[PDB]
Amino acid sequence: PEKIEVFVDDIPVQVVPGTTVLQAAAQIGVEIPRFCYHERLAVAGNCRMCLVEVEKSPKPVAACAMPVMKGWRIKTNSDLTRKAREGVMEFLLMNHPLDCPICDQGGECDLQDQAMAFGSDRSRFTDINYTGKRAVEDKDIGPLVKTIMTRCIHCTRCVRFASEIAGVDDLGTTGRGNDMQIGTYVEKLFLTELSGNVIDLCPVGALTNKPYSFVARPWEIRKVSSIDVLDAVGSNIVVSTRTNEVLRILPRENEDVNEEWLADKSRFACDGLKRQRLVAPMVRMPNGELQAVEWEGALIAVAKAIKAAGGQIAGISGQLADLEAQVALKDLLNRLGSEVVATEQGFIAGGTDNRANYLLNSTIAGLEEADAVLLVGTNPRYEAPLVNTRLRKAYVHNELQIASIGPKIDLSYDHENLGADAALVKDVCSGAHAFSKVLEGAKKPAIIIGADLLERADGAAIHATVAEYCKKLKKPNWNPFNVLQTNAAQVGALDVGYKAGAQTAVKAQPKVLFLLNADAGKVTREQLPKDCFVVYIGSHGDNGASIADAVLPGAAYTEKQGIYVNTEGRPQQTLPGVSPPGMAREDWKILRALSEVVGKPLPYDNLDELRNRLEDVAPHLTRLGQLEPAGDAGAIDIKLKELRDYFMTDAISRASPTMAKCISAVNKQQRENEAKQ
Amino acid sequence: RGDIEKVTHTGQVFDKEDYRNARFVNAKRYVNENWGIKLIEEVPPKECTERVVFCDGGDGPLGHPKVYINLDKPGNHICGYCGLRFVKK
Amino acid sequence: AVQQVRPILSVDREEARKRALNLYKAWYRQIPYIVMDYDIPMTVEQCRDKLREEFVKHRNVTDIRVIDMLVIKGQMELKESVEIWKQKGHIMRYWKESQDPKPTDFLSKFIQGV
Amino acid sequence: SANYYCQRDGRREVLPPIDLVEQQKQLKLPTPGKVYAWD
Amino acid sequence: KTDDAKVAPPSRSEMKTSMEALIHHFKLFTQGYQVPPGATYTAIEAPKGEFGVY
Amino acid sequence: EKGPLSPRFRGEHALRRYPSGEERCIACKLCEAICPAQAITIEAEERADGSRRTTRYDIDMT
Amino acid sequence: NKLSGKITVPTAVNLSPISGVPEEHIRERRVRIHIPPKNAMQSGTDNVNTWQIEFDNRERWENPLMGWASSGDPLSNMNVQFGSPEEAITFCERNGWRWYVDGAAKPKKERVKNYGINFAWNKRTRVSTK
Amino acid sequence: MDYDGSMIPAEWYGWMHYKTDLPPIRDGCRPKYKWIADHSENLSGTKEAYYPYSTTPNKVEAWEPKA
Amino acid sequence: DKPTVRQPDAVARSHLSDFGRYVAECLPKYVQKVQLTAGDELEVLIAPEGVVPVLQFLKDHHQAQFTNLVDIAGVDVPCRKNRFEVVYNLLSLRYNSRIRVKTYTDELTPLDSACEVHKAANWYEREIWDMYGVFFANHPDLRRILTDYGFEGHPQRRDFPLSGYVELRYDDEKKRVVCEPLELAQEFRKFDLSAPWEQFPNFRNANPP
Ligand code: SF4
Ligand code: SF4
Ligand code: SF4
Ligand code: FES
Ligand SMILES: [Zn+2]
């Protein structure tokens, strides 16, 4: 398709035909002011701020939605454009209220910025003295999104986002004329895993974070690039620190993975990093109370127990442990002579060796390219919401055939439910069902199996057959087999060489135990050997931490620099934005100190020494930001099938106050459905 | 002394065993006696007829910027700036 | 990876040493005067010892140009000590006696914070 | 009225520096200015 | 005062009523005003002499 | 005897209150953003009434 | 036999000693060459066209007296801009720092972004509302 | 003989500086609100002296072993 | 009809413009470029070697007679391979006009000295040497001016922390003032004042490589 030649501002430009004027102007470099246009939303002409003049224009055209045509001449900065822009902003600023100082988007508001650049500087609106402005009742929409609609400019970003990206469909417009409002005609709660993203979409401060309300201004605050850790998507984050306080979280545009959206859990659970925190080493007395002690006694006491326990030790890594903590943990236990190093979330026995057996080989970006997707009892909407919306983008732009072989769930879009019984996956893998024919006929089939199922029971057979069928489904440059990992450390464990299954470590019968912030109930001292001495090296004092005889504080993920391998497999680096509290240290530093206290020092006294020890173990694993290919790959009832299940998953999640409010609010709206009836 | 006992309206009292108490062994811990929360509570909620009213809080250019507050909802409506309260009924 | 560039003073590494050692002469010869002039604790042997270590401070300098500048700095500081523009505080600065050598081994770092 | 900012603004009016030789390429001994008898 | 409210701050009276006066008050005091790129010299007959800022 | 000054004299700082007695400050944080010496520090939250108000508001007259 | 005393010297000249930075910072601190992140709730993108370098966070505690954010770490705010990463790496070496680039992003892949797809007869992409 | 510069009260301060030509006895247009305190000297070097202190309740909550 | 917008002296632009070409075609080997900044001043961009010849040419030739050398303003700009830029802003009383000469240099190569041309510059070279470290060749005495004795580093560079690396106090053990590593009561809070929206189109593509 030959590219057209068009003189954007007296500069020849190349555009594939059908390109919009705006999309061409950015190509060359000029930017047109927009309000209702966004890269990842349907096109509409609402603001009329993107207007621009083309030579011999009877009518200025909206660049945002104007396909370019041969031999045009777009006069971006010609006076007619300037006349248009000023008039449009005089209009927008008529009856926007005088609420910048109390509006949380102050100093971050596109209306302010575009008023500065492209608007006038005098108020022709004289009617403030006669009849004033308009006003609109605010809406109740949830415990997360504070709504002040009297500032809205009806850009419909919220309308379009909800309808398409999240498919909630419950937020819309009403009325004619200047009294047109936005919201829900009757009071409801906009409850949705992706609901946070509307706060970033609303160009004006009509929708804003309830928790991060009034707390700080953008000019004061400081930005730190980082990566989300609460979900195995590993989305890129910009942690918004100000003076040793993580005020909020924002998505960092990494369209290969992050997609620029962000789930509610990652967005809002940041408060969890300020409550139930461990700020002092503790050791369990004969009274048993775990009084506070100092680092000297603590590690010395721990080194005492390890030496005299009798060389029967285990380490069970949690789910928020960075790969450095795993490697430091493993190396120390190899000095001690114990290879019992399990991970909480179990996995396939005897298939953990080929890299592609525990990843998303389908290139999460490529998921949107998928054509026929088969989700065997693997609810993405609450297991990987960012992955879920990628699928919906496919479902909307490429006719994605989405079947299900699990229990009932709702994916925000139609999906064919073939049953639940695990015998269905076998018949499909043989290719004896109608959707199997669809899979055959497709060009980008995908088969997604949730890691929970792979650890459920006797599921290694299920995986083996699934890999067996993927052999035929393989199309060049495309590996169908997909595994939505859940914890952000599981893939880290596999690349260092752990075992899988906390019960595995218990079955070893160790005299001492190590727990990298492992706050899952999968291990209980009752279920442990009675004499088993228990050491916990995690940040939040959660219940799993409650059952240890020694409790070493740790700095949470935002506070520590670590490496996390995301689901698909790229390794990514957190950066520390906040000084840790109390005596908290880095996890890989706690282990290193303990080794040298025992008398079996590790070789890595610095992060780089450790990062080179990982380089030894996996050169692929230190090529940050890249993804080495792995090639060939090798009833059903699941959790997180409702939002109520989703909000309370991890220790940080339970720690957060806002999430607890969210759970209560959803329960109450359900009760309203029962009783308001 | 009561000076180092009072609860600042912001909500702080030095813990009874907290070394930062020491700084007041010889100086007063000023705490203000007017708490805005109580005062605005006392002020009664003004009422009007029109669906939409306007507040500047103070007077003329001696108050906060003019703001329009709709009253169609049943409840009260608090001025964002001054905390004045409006009710149409 | 070479660049055909201007000189500053010294055209060859040996001229650089010639200049560098000239400075070492002035500083060695000066030390006794400063012990007298500046009423500070330091004694001649210690001042001489520091002068040795402070040249050793940068032994593996390689570029002709860089070593030229280091000498330019020294000739300046020489004159500022030769004449008494400096002060007893300024001259002692080379010892850094206000701060105790901070912990270095991992436990002392670990037990004393980042 | 007739008070548009676009047609009275200065900051959007200023240009980058021009290259005089290239100015000529587009196309009384000269003196910087009126001689002053600073004498 | 120069008429350009994008350059010098607006008056309080206009600020508390009109909208873009408030925006301009807001942006000028927080971000200031972009100055077009360039270098310039100036001098003044200050009492000590020609005081200048480059 | 003493003086004279003018009404604009710039001296001791003070945080005023509305005619009702309510705090005028709303934590808009412009004062900090402009303060040439960066002598102002502010931290604001929601009082239980839901109003945008300061918690800490500090000035260093050194 | 000279061009005003010109000399042949390697292009890469380490300048750590002449610089004046204490060796403590030079030997314990890295640099994070990158492009500044794009603000999430903005849409103009003319402040992320430059390559930026800074130094890793060290520490921040609070002043016991007044509860400020005390910090005894000098290169905390330090921040410099460049036009291209290779320029910055060249600079960073010449000042003898340890650094590790952070690849910004691949060129944006064209998105069709048609208007007609909003209204289609068969495709799922029909808009629910306007 | 302990006169001080701060003994002047608020309502008279302006007149005393030639800052207002309206004696407080004459202009009753100034505010007469309730919360207004009464005057005070530069209470310094004495037990009545001000002394600063943090005005933010603590940031991060510690985990409680008992609960 | 725009009272806000000033109107420069056009005739002054005329004279400076033609004169600028005069300088360019009279010193071909040195003058790299001559431009007329919109602020009506005239800039003369030379190569580092011609510093003295340009200055000597200006102060002496009839048509220039730029006698006073107002200052030596130093500019630092990383991302320019030889970054440290220098500006020689001159005056001419005979013709009542101002001119600016500019040159570049790196942190390593030395630079010509104006001490032999204008006695006025002597202190300025000392000032830039102290403030950036730009050596000057043939300068009589390159002693530091502003910074205190035994100060390491040149602060006006943009790769130097604002508050410096060390700070002083007083010791009782030693009856003397000691320099210590930095320690700040309240860390200097930057503010990120970056424009998201390009407020100036005219400079966008202009001056491209
Ligand atoms: S959205 Fe907020 S910041 Fe923007 S103009 Fe409106 S009140 Fe001001
Ligand atoms: S609420 Fe926000 S996103 Fe929705 S139309 Fe109004 S301004 Fe746009
Ligand atoms: S934060 Fe500062 S500028 Fe804003 S209202 Fe309060 S005192 Fe005034
Ligand atoms: S961006 Fe084109 S009308 Fe809104
Ligand atoms: Zn009000």
From TrEMBL, chain B:
One of the GO biological process terms: mitochondrial electron transport, NADH to ubiquinone
Subcellular location: Mitochondrion inner membrane
Key words, A-Z: Electron transport, Membrane, Metal-binding, Mitochondrion, Mitochondrion inner membrane, Respiratory chain, Transit peptide, Transport, Zinc
GO cellular component, one term: respiratory chain complex I
Keyword Cell membrane: no
Residue intervals of the Zinc finger CHCC-type domain: 51-86
Domain of life: Eukaryota
Residues given in the record as Zn(2+) binding sites: C55, H64, C79, C82
Membrane topology: Peripheral membrane protein
Record family assignment: Belongs to the complex I NDUFS6 subunit family.
General function of this protein: Accessory subunit of the mitochondrial membrane respiratory chain NADH dehydrogenase (Complex I), that is believed not to be involved in catalysis. Complex I functions in the transfer of electrons from NADH to the respiratory chain. The immediate electron acceptor for the enzyme is believed to be ubiquinone.
Protein's name according to its UniProt entry: NADH dehydrogenase [ubiquinone] iron-sulfur protein 6, mitochondrial
Organism (species): Drosophila melanogaster
Automatic annotation (TrEMBL), chain C:
Domain Complex 1 LYR protein residues, every copy: 21-80
Chain ranges passing through the membrane: none
GO terms assigned for molecular function: oxidoreductase activity
UniProt entry keywords in alphabetical sequence: Electron transport, Membrane, Mitochondrion, Mitochondrion inner membrane, Oxidoreductase, Respiratory chain, Transport
Cellular component terms (Gene Ontology): mitochondrial inner membrane; mitochondrion; respiratory chain complex I
Biological process (GO), any one: mitochondrial electron transport, NADH to ubiquinone
This protein's record includes keyword Mitochondrion: yes
Localization annotation: Mitochondrion inner membrane
Database matches in InterPro entries: Complex1_LYR_dom (IPR008011), Complex1_LYR_NDUFA6_LYRM6 (IPR045299), NADH_Ub_cplx-1_asu_su-6 (IPR016488)
Predominant location: mitochondrion
Membrane topology: Peripheral membrane protein
Function: Accessory subunit of the mitochondrial membrane respiratory chain NADH dehydrogenase (Complex I), that is believed to be not involved in catalysis. Required for proper complex I assembly. Complex I functions in the transfer of electrons from NADH to the respiratory chain. The immediate electron acceptor for the enzyme is believed to be ubiquinone.
Similarity field: Belongs to the complex I LYR family.
Oligomer status and interactors: Mammalian complex I is composed of 45 different subunits.
Protein name: NADH dehydrogenase [ubiquinone] 1 alpha subcomplex subunit 6
Organism: Drosophila melanogaster (Fruit fly)
Species lineage: Eukaryota, Metazoa, Ecdysozoa, Arthropoda, Hexapoda
From TrEMBL, chain E:
Family designation: Belongs to the complex I 49 kDa subunit family.
Protein name per the record: Complex I-49kD
Source organism phylogeny: Eukaryota, Metazoa, Ecdysozoa, Arthropoda, Hexapoda
Source superkingdom: Eukaryota
Automatic annotation (TrEMBL), chain H:
Keyword Cell membrane: no
Plastid is among the record's keywords: no
Cell compartment(s), UniProt: Mitochondrion inner membrane
Main location: mitochondrion
Swiss-Prot/TrEMBL keywords: Electron transport, Membrane, Mitochondrion, Mitochondrion inner membrane, Respiratory chain, Transport
Domain of life assignment: Eukaryota
GO terms for biological process, alphabetical: mitochondrial ATP synthesis coupled electron transport; mitochondrial electron transport, NADH to ubiquinone
GO annotations of cellular component type: mitochondrial inner membrane; respiratory chain complex I
Signal peptide: none
Function as written in the Swiss-Prot or TrEMBL entry: Accessory subunit of the mitochondrial membrane respiratory chain NADH dehydrogenase (Complex I), that is believed not to be involved in catalysis. Complex I functions in the transfer of electrons from NADH to the respiratory chain. The immediate electron acceptor for the enzyme is believed to be ubiquinone.
Family to which this protein belongs: Belongs to the complex I NDUFA12 subunit family.
Subunit relationships: Complex I is composed of 45 different subunits.
Protein name: NADH dehydrogenase [ubiquinone] 1 alpha subcomplex subunit 12
Species the sequence originates in: Drosophila melanogaster
Residues of the full protein shown: 73 to 139 of 142
